[model samples]
Target: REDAELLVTVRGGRLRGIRLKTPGGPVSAFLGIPFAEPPMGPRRFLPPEPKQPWSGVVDATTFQSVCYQYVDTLYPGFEGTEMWNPNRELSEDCLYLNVWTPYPRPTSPTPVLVWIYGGGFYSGASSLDVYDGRFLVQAERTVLVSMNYRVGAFGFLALPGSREAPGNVGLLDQRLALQWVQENVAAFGGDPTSVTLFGESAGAASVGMHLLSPPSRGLFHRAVLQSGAPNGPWATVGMGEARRRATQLAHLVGCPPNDTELVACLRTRPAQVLVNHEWHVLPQESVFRFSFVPVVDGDFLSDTPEALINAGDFHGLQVLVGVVKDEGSYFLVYGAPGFSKDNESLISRAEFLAGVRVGVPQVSDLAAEAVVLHYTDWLHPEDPARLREALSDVVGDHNVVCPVAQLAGRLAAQGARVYAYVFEHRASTLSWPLWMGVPHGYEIEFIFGIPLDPSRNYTAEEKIFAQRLMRYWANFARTGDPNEAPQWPPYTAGAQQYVSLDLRPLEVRRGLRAQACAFWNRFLPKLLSA
Candidate 1:
């Protein structure tokens, strides 16, 4: 009877999962379950097709392949980059999903939490060790699902006006996976109506884009955006820029750039050859820029994120959006190219101004000067270390923190139930320098309850904090509100109150980075326009 309980029949075939032992309890895990047909041959650079039905029981006990991406080794022997690298081999046939559910199967359906992994839309996988869903499922008694989608050239190459290579196929892959969950999650004791979609970085930007996408309506009822938004400077590109990047890639691979033949020519090239030339297409303007990203395609994305949000054109789903205290420290230390070289030295004032121009290349000289004046700490004018902190603040506020806060405020004005936060807790086990407080993507471990597992050497306080973090997340998934014992006030356009997550008491604060966010979200835009 127990063995039969682990078997589930869905649209594709019968899948037999394995029981995973977690610190909270035992949970059933189904791994490497295919949801779409292989995007090989004729299906390359096109939208995903549903997986065909199979005849026999399929083994879903092992993780599957990850989408091809350039692995970064910028900091050799450093745990920062190594921790996020995909563990499996790279392949084009990588459309799969994983699930973790209560082992005994609850009599009534439970809330479903679906995750989308982020790697700047260039790299990411659902099989990363940090994203394992067993701990969260066991702790909260909720069903969890995560899916693998295409990235880099294979997923986002857009030849304008070409039906064959319409951009944002990666996003379409995610949509198909959600549809699969809606159709088959009942077998796993999950409620389709209560599904909450969440992600970090590029994954979070994808969530924001789905809010603006007409086809993605009703796919998810709630969202949690961590450290990213659709309006963030690095999140998207116009079709004109996308085409330029596409043409550059085709030239690098000796393929014709004509819209009629570009998709066909790209199909002839090897997958490795396409990915190897991906980064070569980036222009020299900004270190923060991405070569390939979601484009303003008329069908998938009707308008620019700013325009859509301003017009109240998106779905008003209950949302929780926030950023880490020092969201840009990770980029300066390890992610960016030249900035990663000298970690020990402090940046001079002149270098700080130059960094601002490079990060936001579109800003006029006057506006750039205004930005420098705003972020500069006058009390310690000669302190190089203070200058470095100011630069990190500029990077973080302009690219991530401010944009997210602005998005939350705008959504609240449109009558959506929005909860906001600013994560200030820094982990004791972090290998980064002491000054880098709560850098980007750090809260993911706590959200997934990785520290709660006994084998990991985390402090007892950290374990307690992780449990609370998971409770807040699962509570949001269960109901629209994240309140449980501790009070978390709903964000509003006028009040703008947000919870401050830390090891110290969870405090509710008003107007996160108010002055900085106003500069980026309000003053700077009007300044540039003038």
Candidate 2:
């Protein structure tokens, strides 16, 4: 019955979407609609160009190819990272987006939720099954959108002053998609003006970048950052570092290191060649370190994210920001080569200190000692298990937890309406050790309503929790407030109020990791300078 009405006219031309039935209701899904021209050949290192309009009704039912990237096989048979690997065909022609809205189409425009996936700026695609927006749209009655952007060298290769290879084309890809939504989302029963830009990890960092970027100012009115901030140590690179990495990558791939010549040579190389050679430039110190990432380009990003945030130069949009309780456990389990092999019980004091130095290479030996002392439990300082836990806490605080808290506090101080949370719930389906605790990305399945899907064997209580999470997220998208029955207070620098999301009864708390966050955000910087 709804087949005939599935066609919607976008700027590119008419599109025919597919109908998907959910427990809540039927949803109209438009998948793999081109938002930009294919970034290939001569355009490999350049910014994205808007896709030209097409003629006749274009089919938008199936997902399109994801950007060319090396599928991560580091863990071999581990499902943790493998689950996030792109499932679609990989290619340079991957600049597409997907949309999900109510089937019958509401008379009033529904709020739009634009999601940006996270994979440390090197990998990720909108086609990942975990990111499917069908259930979220059905349950929340909101229009959902996700886009595919370039990753790795193809997306972020920098050549300092060279326009052809200016860094951050990946972020530029995201910007163009947002512009497309501004022009065409109304056709899908969405309120473009009410768009809430949200993402996880690198995606969340991208959202924070959008908040600071001049071109992205008016594109999104509200933001949700899950477990990342632009100012985080790993979020972006300096122009010099970006250039060095680009040159190194060029040399590794047998191309000249000269700016213009490098880009020209790289454009001619096969996509797989460029992707496979990425590991050559990666620092051997830590698995968490990324090669190609957003840079402090004067045009797209005027300055360091810390400087921008300190000057209050970001969009004052309502924001909801958060981090999982054990953001670092995932890295220890899957990212830290052999940490999990011995069940994480064999870490000695020297190994713990080495891990800290590797994770924060810039810290002075004195400061490293201070850091170790801070995280170490005084009573059981000799215990190896405690050392492992201390290392995990240190990594979590340095990479995510502290950075997120600092950003939230700063935003709240600058008078932005901010809602902060620490997700404490661990999913039951994960076969990880009990000590893993609510590791990184554990909340994603819940946020995406995976538990509510009939195929997944989640507990009944989890389904109910997913419903609550969807409602909270959608409510924020609609009104910039996530409150309903149990009140969630706005974050303030003074009180540091935030909600703890878990399967148990939701709890409103004050000062999430106050002492630890202060150690990282406040004391460490001064100590380093001294």
Candidate 3:
């Protein structure tokens, strides 16, 4: 983010950087440079085509118009629709990404953070107001990038007739973006060698896959997964299910699987109509059980990420993995009971019960419990409502603990440098509802030092918190050693240790009984919704 510079790499093609209005000083930014050909028309649903060189200087002063976003608030403290409304256009031509960089110090090879926003693979866009990276670029002295990917039916639809249509078009889009960064970031003052891939919720799951995907091997040197675990059964079941989903889509759309016309027709359908297509129709434990997820297609994904990580492949990389204090609050908010205030309302409430009430039949009480307890206890260990605390822990762990623990074990086996964290602190400054407690995605703001409301502004205490989070992330990106200047702990099952980021002093905590997480893993074969 130094002086506005132009890199006319693509012959006469020049990428422009506009000055940013930062609280500190001016920053430079470039937004929405296509890494691949637009996924429109004949190219819809195909692998991302490399961006052809363009001639002449291109103005990249503003954020890209997000392709399409499902139901997700553009920013916290604000709200938005998750549904595409069954009538909105859903396009297959969806390959776009955004970038933010501080004015670079002359020839500064700053680290890059490629963020994948999350909304359960249903809806999210890089244009969200909260993700404005001016604060991060100037403050962290790093290049920040965010991306958009296909989602919902258009992205995950699996049907019987379509044998080659792999699911998670959204995720594949992410890989393509990373590949783009690998090739072009150096021109933006970003060090391709020091790229860090990070995300929350579904984005985290995507990060987990990238860690194991051969296509992503050299794209990123570090990773940070927040509030998500790998291989949530419903998200990464396997190819059989993905193919099955495509088959279902064919029948739903009433088209032949092999019909290229059907593919074109489906690609042009409304985003809302497709987004509303039923996915949670199957039970969780089944292999083809996932609605839309990364499939074990021999191309983008050769083997299951779980199997790959287990084989000790993530060597020499640095990893920082953790979940929020109230990771499950969102579960209950959308689960069955719907949104409500009174913790009294949440007391003993089960999302499985809510799912049933709401007509989602395949849910499990375990999923409900995991979401609930993970939020409550991890944040308020001593809340007067012990019952709610227990439930929150139960719900949270099911969704996050297993994936993160598996990551720790796999990365540790490879002798990779790693640091584990538990975001036990919730910002009182957060203007959002409290029942969400320290809900998923809350940690990003604290890490970026962005405030919930300007009036609530970051207190001196909060700045220190942001510094620590940024340092840990930046340090890891720099040397894969988050413990550089701090009393860092490498992830070891023997130590049963992980650093806690909370209102309390930062220190390693033990007695996590992550065995509970293992128990869920052991029972993976038996647990399923529907």
Off by over 4 Å in 1: 313-316, 334-342
Q: Write the per-residue lDDT of candidate 3 for residues 101-150, one digit (tens) a residue.
A: 76653267879999987766656666666566767777678888887777
382-484: candidate 2 lDDT, tens digit per residue: 7887877777888888889888888888888887999998888878787567677888887888999989888878999999999989988999999999987
Task: Determine the C-alpha RMSD for candidate 3 after optimal superposition of all C-alphas.
Answer: 5.3
**Model 3, C-alpha of 365: deviation from truth (Å):** 9.6
In angstroms, the error of model 1 at 295 is 0.5
Models 1 onward score TM values of 0.96, 0.96, 0.83
Model 2 residue runs over 4 Å out of place are: 313-316, 334-338, 341-346
Residue-level lDDT tens digits of model 1 in 85-125: 87899999999999889977655889999999999889999
Candidate lDDT (C-alpha), each? 0.86, 0.86, 0.63
Clashing pairs in 2: none
Error of 1 at 383 (Å): 2.0
Q: After superposition, how far is residue 487 of candidate 3 from its true place, in Å?
A: 1.4
- How does candidate 3 fare on TM-score? 0.83
